[PDB]
Amino acid sequence: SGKIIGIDLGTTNSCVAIMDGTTPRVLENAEGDRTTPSIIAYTQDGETLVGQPAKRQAVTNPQNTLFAIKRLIGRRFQDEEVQRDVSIMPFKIIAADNGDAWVEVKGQKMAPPQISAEVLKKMKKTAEDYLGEPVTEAVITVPAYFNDAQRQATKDAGRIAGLEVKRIINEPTAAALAYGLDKGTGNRTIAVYDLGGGAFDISIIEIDEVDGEKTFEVLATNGDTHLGGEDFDSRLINYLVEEFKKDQGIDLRNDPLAMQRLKEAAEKAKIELSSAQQTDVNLPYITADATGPKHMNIKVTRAKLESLVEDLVNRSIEPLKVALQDAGLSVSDIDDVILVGGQTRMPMVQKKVAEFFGKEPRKDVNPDEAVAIGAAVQGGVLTGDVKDVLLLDVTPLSLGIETMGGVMTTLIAKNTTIPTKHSQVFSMGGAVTIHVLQGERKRAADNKSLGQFNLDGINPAPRGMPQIEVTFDIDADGILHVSAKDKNSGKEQKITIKASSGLNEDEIQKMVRDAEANAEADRKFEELVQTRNQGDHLLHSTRKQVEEAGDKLPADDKTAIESALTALETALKGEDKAAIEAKMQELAQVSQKLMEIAQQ
Amino acid sequence: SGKIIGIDLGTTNSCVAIMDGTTPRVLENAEGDRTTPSIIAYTQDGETLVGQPAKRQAVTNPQNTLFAIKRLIGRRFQDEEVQRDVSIMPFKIIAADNGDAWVEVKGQKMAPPQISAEVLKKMKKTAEDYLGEPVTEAVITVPAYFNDAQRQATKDAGRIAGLEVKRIINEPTAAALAYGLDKGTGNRTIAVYDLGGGAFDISIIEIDEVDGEKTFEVLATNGDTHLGGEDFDSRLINYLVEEFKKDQGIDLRNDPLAMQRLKEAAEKAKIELSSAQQTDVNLPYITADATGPKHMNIKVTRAKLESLVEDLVNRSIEPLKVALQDAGLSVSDIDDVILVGGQTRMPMVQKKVAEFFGKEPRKDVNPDEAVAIGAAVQGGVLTGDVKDVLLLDVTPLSLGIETMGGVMTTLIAKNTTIPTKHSQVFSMGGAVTIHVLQGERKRAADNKSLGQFNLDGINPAPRGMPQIEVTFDIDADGILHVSAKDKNSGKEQKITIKASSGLNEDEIQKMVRDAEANAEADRKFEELVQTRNQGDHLLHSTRKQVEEAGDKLPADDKTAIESALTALETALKGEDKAAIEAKMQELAQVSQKLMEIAQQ
Numbered sequence A, B: 001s002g003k004i005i006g007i008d009l010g011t012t013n014s015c016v017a018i019m020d021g022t023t024p025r026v027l028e029n030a031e032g033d034r035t036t037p038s039i040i041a042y043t044q045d046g047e048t049l050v051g052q053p054a055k056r057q058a059v060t061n062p063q064n065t066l067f068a069i070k071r072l073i074g075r076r077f078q079d080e081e082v083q084r085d086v087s088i089m090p091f092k093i094i095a096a097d098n099g100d101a102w103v104e105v106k107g108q109k110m111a112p113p114q115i116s117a118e119v120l121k122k123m124k125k126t127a128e129d130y131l132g133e134p135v136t137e138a139v140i141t142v143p144a145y146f147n148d149a150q151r152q153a154t155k156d157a158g159r160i161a162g163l164e165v166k167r168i169i170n171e172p173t174a175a176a177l178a179y180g181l182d183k184g185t186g187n188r189t190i191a192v193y194d195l196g197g198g199a200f201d202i203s204i205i206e207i208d209e210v211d212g213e214k215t216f217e218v219l220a221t222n223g224d225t226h227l228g229g230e231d232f233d234s235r236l237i238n239y240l241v242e243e244f245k246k247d248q249g250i251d252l253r254n255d256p257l258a259m260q261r262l263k264e265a266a267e268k269a270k271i272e273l274s275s276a277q278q279t280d281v282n283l284p285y286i287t288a289d290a291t292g293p294k295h296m297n298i299k300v301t302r303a304k305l306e307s308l309v310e311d312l313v314n315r316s317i318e319p320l321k322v323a324l325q326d327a328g329l330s331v332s333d334i335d336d337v338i339l340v341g342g343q344t345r346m347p348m349v350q351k352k353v354a355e356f357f358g359k360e361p362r363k364d365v366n367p368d369e370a371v372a373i374g375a376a377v378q379g380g381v382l383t384g385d386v387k388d389v390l391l392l393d394v395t396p397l398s399l400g401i402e403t404m405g406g407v408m409t410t411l412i413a414k415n416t417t418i419p420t421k422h423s424q425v426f427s428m429g430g431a432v433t434i435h436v437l438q439g440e441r442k443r444a445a446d447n448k449s450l451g452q453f454n455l456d457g458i459n460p461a462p463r464g465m466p467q468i469e470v471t472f473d474i475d476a477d478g479i480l481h482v483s484a485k486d487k488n489s490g491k492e493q494k495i496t497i498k499a500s501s502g503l504n505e506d507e508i509q510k511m512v513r514d515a516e517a518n519a520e521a522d523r524k525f526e527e528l529v530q531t532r533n534q535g536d537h538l539l540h541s542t543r544k545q546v547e548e549a550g551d552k553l554p555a556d557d558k559t560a561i562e563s564a565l566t567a568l569e570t571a572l573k574g575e576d577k578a579a580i581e582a583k584m585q586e587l588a589q590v591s592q593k594l595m596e597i598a599q600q
């Protein structure tokens, strides 16, 4: 029911679009911006900020501002990437009871999907404000290289936000839909290079004209879900931290508040160096010492920045080589190179990509909105409003199991088109345990574990010939479903999953309720502010009343009203809602009493 | 030759678009932004900054940062509107020799068109970078209510930027083109309400279908060229100044740095109050008393803000009434209300407009880019690329002359469609002086003077029957051209214009050369930056050369090379190009030498 909205849920920024009749349209949020910082904050006084308002106060609220949660979602606390972030992120990152990576604010433990849900709720509200009706369904994007846990956790975030997730769409695929919508873009093969704030994808995609309809087929995909702008900032921040040690004899890394100003300054500097060739990091009173206040002043050149991050850029080139090999194509087979994501605005990135492909990337693709637009198009395909568009995506990782000798044994090869299914008999009746993993490495230890899937035996029976067949389905969302039956009886077998990541149904249901309670509490937090407005309106009117009365007003009456006004003004400066309300009531009674005496 | 680019030259922000084949496209500037702040700055070391870099340093350089120049362009120094601004603007506004309003920076007097040209040059360069080739032609926008002087001055700015201005297009007309391009927006009548940073326009526009082609006809236009966001900010700034005065007993108005910080904070507060119901203005260390530093902290509710500016909003409603009357329509006849301009994002503004028209404004119009898009479309109509699009605009002000009694006599009524022509015999041979004015007021003294147009007599001659006919042409740009001729002989009569506003050919030519000199100076300034980058590259490589040598390096050689490294690092900390280049040279020679010795 209603419109299926398209939400690009980004590490750094989020963006929502719809089908406006036959044309996709990106929607401005309440603040008037076409994108929304993927940031949530909890203030000391207990307010929940989302988006720009949360971004604005981040510098002074290190611990209770959550950002880049997309780098934690669907991960385990003991993951190398997470363990590194633990020491780096200013907010607190902890292990959930099941070992998943969670955060903690003011003593409260929260799962990443709960945090992303807040961002999704704002995007949902954005669409509803625009449309003038409720929105309950969405297509939500994920990086192409997201694994099973990361996909499912993103899907759970959508549910926690009150959205039925009709499709999880791979971000480069979404960008391709956006690009190929324009008639005259048929019968070509493109490379979509997407380098954002947190993730990197490369997809090779063919757009063809079959039976008078446009088909988008992903030939190969690769990337790195933990490579993006955040890592570029970090290289520059560490340089600035090391320089200030040498220069002013002080280590800033021990100090959260200084690091906030620096983080902010480094990102601005990085961004400036995409157009200028020099930038100044000026942080007066960055810190202090025995000798007094300290100030940071350091010029950074483009050349300096480049030497700091070139290996990150090279890291994005290697998956390109693998993607072309997997697709069986050379660079000359690629008709268009498409750059997506804010971090691709770096000249070095554009230059290295141009040089690899031996051609310049297109300039007519919006690096900030293409993904959301494609998510909207995908939604329109689902509702049937978008005709003559067919899409065939793949799974980015090999699905396998740990077999005898601790080896990784592949069941479904990477770049297999989805949905897809693989069935296999695992037992003639004895119990079965299956350790499922994703990845390309030879040893199970080197791949991403999805969990242990356990089946009980089937007891011996006259004329029974148990054949326990296990089926691995990958659906259109790129998500795995494992089921089993006895082929001999047709009876389904219960599978018990152990050591898997993710939320269970009970947690999800509780978190859905928590999000509704949060909404209520937010509506409850606003009362103080709403009462101030009313207070200001009242002040304005009763002042006019006093002016009108002029000298006709007796001193005792003039004094009583002027005291009531001042009292309300004072209360308004404060934070006590009850006091404001009482002073408003007293002022109203004096305004009414004056009125009544004037009529006499 | 080349593309005719469309440039929205705004009081606050500027935006450039082109026809990308058959589709209009807004172009990002070098900073990656789809719009550019109309801000020009001159730094202490003599650099000229435009756009975001100028905006960024305004807080510390308020005297030599020029902004809102569109509020001075085409105006006289003694104009009431300018005189008010003289006391408000942080930079120095002065009278030119002819009385026009100019600005002075560091002893240099400059004409508004020279300043705006710097913004147009950036927009021009933006298009050139995208297209990969030179751009010499443009369509440039002006408020529909701009008078003759304002139009010509804007056209002069285009020339000074090296642009042949093919069309001056009224901004609401541009927005209508953008809106009506969408097939299926035909046969309707729209009201375009445009409230920006400096100017207000209302235009009533009919979009029809004649002989297969779409025609856009402006039925009426009105507005106020000195009413916009800057005035909203100003109301809030004065409130904040007064509150701090009552609170801390300090008057900030004489503190340029404090006032610049306040200006910025005030606009941010105004903008938040478009989506939130309360905002906090915080300015630590805003001033210092003998008691110590003082900090500004005050909460502002939407209710407070609305009471500070409601009369500004109401001032925009009265021209709506006049426009409908001039169009001969009622609100009922309006099919679509279109809001353009950032200042229309204010809830009070939208509500007042919705209430006036009795319908909700459309939501599917881009308030920041519609005007640039329309300018690009107009450009494509000029090149013959855009087909079946005809536009018919009007002149917004009555054109008249001062007749006996000091009365205003109308020659061309407001809302007459342009281009248009009016011819009249003024003399049977005697010398003639014609005082030309624009406006609707009955007394000449109350209208805008365009100058005195003088004609010499024609001497008595046998068979001569001199009939001096003066022709008033208003061209497609909405600009006046007065010519005269003797109908009896056909000979053209020379007109001498006195007491008029604007730049003469000689000034324009000199200003064109000055701008080219500024570009050259800019390339010069870049030299230092380029040298710094090369320095960083050189440091990087030679450091690797030292490491690779390790212990093999003799103590005297290691000392020498490390001295040279340090000396370059030191020079790069300074601002002396010569020293940097010398230290680069010495480091290079030492590197080369050790290399040679290592080869031995």
Ligand SMILES: Nc1ncnc2c1ncn2[C@@H]1O[C@H](COP(=O)(O)OP(=O)(O)OP(=O)(O)O)[C@@H](O)[C@H]1O
Pocket (backbone or CB within 6 Å): A009, A010, A011, A012, A013, A014, A070, A195, A196, A197, A198, A199, A200, A228, A229, A230, A267, A270, A271, A272, A274, A340, A341, A342, A343, A344, A345, A346, A367, A368, B031, B032
């Ligand atoms: N001009 C610029 N030059 C370099 N980097 C930039 C520029 N502008 C933005 N960025 C960077 O781009 C990143 C954000 O890009 P984007 O909004 O596409 O990410 P995202 O979609 O939120 O992330 P992801 O897709 O990785 O989940 C940030 O790291 C930001 O610093």
Ligand SMILES: Nc1ncnc2c1ncn2[C@@H]1O[C@H](COP(=O)(O)OP(=O)(O)OP(=O)(O)O)[C@@H](O)[C@H]1O
Pocket (backbone or CB within 6 Å): A031, A032, B009, B010, B011, B012, B013, B014, B070, B195, B196, B197, B198, B199, B200, B228, B229, B230, B267, B270, B271, B272, B274, B340, B341, B342, B343, B344, B345, B346, B367, B368
């Ligand atoms: N959310 C908002 N609420 C209120 N005002 C806003 C908002 N966003 C921007 N503005 C204001 O809108 C103005 C800028 O709008 P815009 O960019 O349309 O003006 P412009 O085209 O440069 O000016 P003009 O058309 O008057 O020459 C500024 O005064 C700015 O403060």
Ligand SMILES: [Mg+2]
Pocket (backbone or CB within 6 Å): A010, A011, A171, A196, A197, A341, A371
């Ligand atoms: Mg992204």
Ligand SMILES: [Mg+2]
Pocket (backbone or CB within 6 Å): B010, B011, B171, B196, B197, B341, B371
């Ligand atoms: Mg404008």
